């Protein structure tokens, strides 16, 4: 019970069908082999018939959209900055100049 | 439709707030001008009495 | 908003939010972040040839970070006031000395 | 050729100073202008 959970009980809801709640073996993303040149995770999954669809957040870019018609995006992601909160610092000398 | 080459959403648009550059006589602001001037005529009046 | 001088508070898009604060005099700022979340998309007519070459031209668009590059020289790169002091220059705590001059 | 169509008030498409020295396609200017040229030459057809 998550966040793709509830979307795909969502997602059912107004596309009546039966499904399966099943979880992915190798845990992995769609990823080109290097000289096997086969998929893996959802991607290798969906491609040689494993599952029906995938409720996950999926990086939707070029070499996978050739191969897996995505649909249009629930959410946005975005490469953001994390840092420690600024607590205050400890008072060095000098201090009542300030 | 194709892919969104773009997002978007509903933002906020408010006035940006000027430097405001405080006055030249700006620490006359704690007491009012009233104030000010009634401690001069209460200054001279004191060191009349007092002479 | 500009002759309300913080007292009324638009509510518009990102893209014309920035583009107004950029490319017109920088009056006015954009605060806070996308309260929903939209986005644009070029079409094409309903059972025609012309989607999944041009579907796959956007992605590789965006891909390439050339829709960022394109943004960032019609948003700023061509503003109106521009982009005056781009350091932030930060709140000093201290006194200034226009408070006792 | 292909028919394309846009929207002109707005700051993505634009009239560029000068119109009557230009022609066509080459008078409008900006932002989604470069999208379009980009995207035909992607793809590979003229518009
Ligand atoms: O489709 C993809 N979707 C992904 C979604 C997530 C998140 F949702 F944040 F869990 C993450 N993480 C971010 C940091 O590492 C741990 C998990 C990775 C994803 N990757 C691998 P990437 O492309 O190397 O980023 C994909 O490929
Ligand atoms: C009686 C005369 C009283 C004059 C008070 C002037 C106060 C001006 C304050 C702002 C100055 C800005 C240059
Ligand atoms: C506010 C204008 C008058 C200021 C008078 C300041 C007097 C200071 C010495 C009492
Ligand atoms: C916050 C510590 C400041 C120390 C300054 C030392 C100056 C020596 C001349
Ligand atoms: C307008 C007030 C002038 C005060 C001059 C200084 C008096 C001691």
């Given at each position: ?18 499904y ?10 769609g ?5 096997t ?5 959802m991607?290798?999954?969906?491609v040689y ?6 409720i ?7 070499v ?10 629930f ?24 | ?6 997002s978007?959403g509903?933002?906020?648009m ?19 001008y009233?104030?000010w ?15 | ?5 913080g007292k009324?508070?638009?509510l518009?898009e ?12 920088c ?5 806070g ?27 590789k ?5 050339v829709?960022?590059?394109?943004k960032?020289?019609w ?14 220059k ?6 200034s ?5 | ?8 008030e ?11 020295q ?21 793809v590979?057809?003229?518009?």
């Amino acid at each position: 019970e998550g966040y793709c959970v509830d979307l795909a009980a969502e997602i059912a809801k107004h596309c009546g069908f039966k499904y399966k709640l099943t979880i992915v073996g190798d845990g992995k993303y769609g990823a080109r082999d290097a000289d096997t040149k086969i998929w893996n995770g959802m991607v290798g999954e969906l491609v040689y018939g494993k599952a029906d669809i995938a409720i996950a957040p999926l990086t939707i870019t070029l070499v996978r959209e050739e191969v897996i018609d995505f649909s249009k995006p629930f959410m946005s992601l975005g490469i953001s900055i994390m840092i420690k909160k600024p607590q205050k610092s400890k008072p060095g000398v000098f201090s009542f100049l300030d | 439709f194709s892919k969104p080459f773009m997002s978007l959403g509903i933002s906020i648009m408010i006035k940006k707030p000027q430097k405001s550059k405080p006055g030249v006589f700006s620490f006359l602001d704690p007491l009012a001008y009233e104030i000010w001037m009634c401690i001069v005529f209460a200054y001279i009046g004191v060191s009349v009495v007092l002479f | 908003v500009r002759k309300s001088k913080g007292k009324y508070a638009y509510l518009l898009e990102s893209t014309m939010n920035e583009y107004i604060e950029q490319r017109k005099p920088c009056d006015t700022m954009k605060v806070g972040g996308n309260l929903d979340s939209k986005g644009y998309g070029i079409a094409t007519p309903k059972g025609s040839a012309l989607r999944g070459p041009v579907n796959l031209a956007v992605l590789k668009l965006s891909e390439q970070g050339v829709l960022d590059k394109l943004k960032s020289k019609w948003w700023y790169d061509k503003g109106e006031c521009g982009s005056k002091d781009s350091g932030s220059k930060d709140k000093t705590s201290a006194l200034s000395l226009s408070n006792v001059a | 050729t292909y028919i394309v169509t846009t929207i002109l008030e707005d700051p993505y498409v634009m009239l560029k100073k000068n119109a009557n020295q230009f022609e066509g396609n080459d008078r409008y200017e900006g932002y989604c202008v470069e999208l379009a040229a980009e995207i035909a030459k992607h793809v590979g057809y003229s518009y």
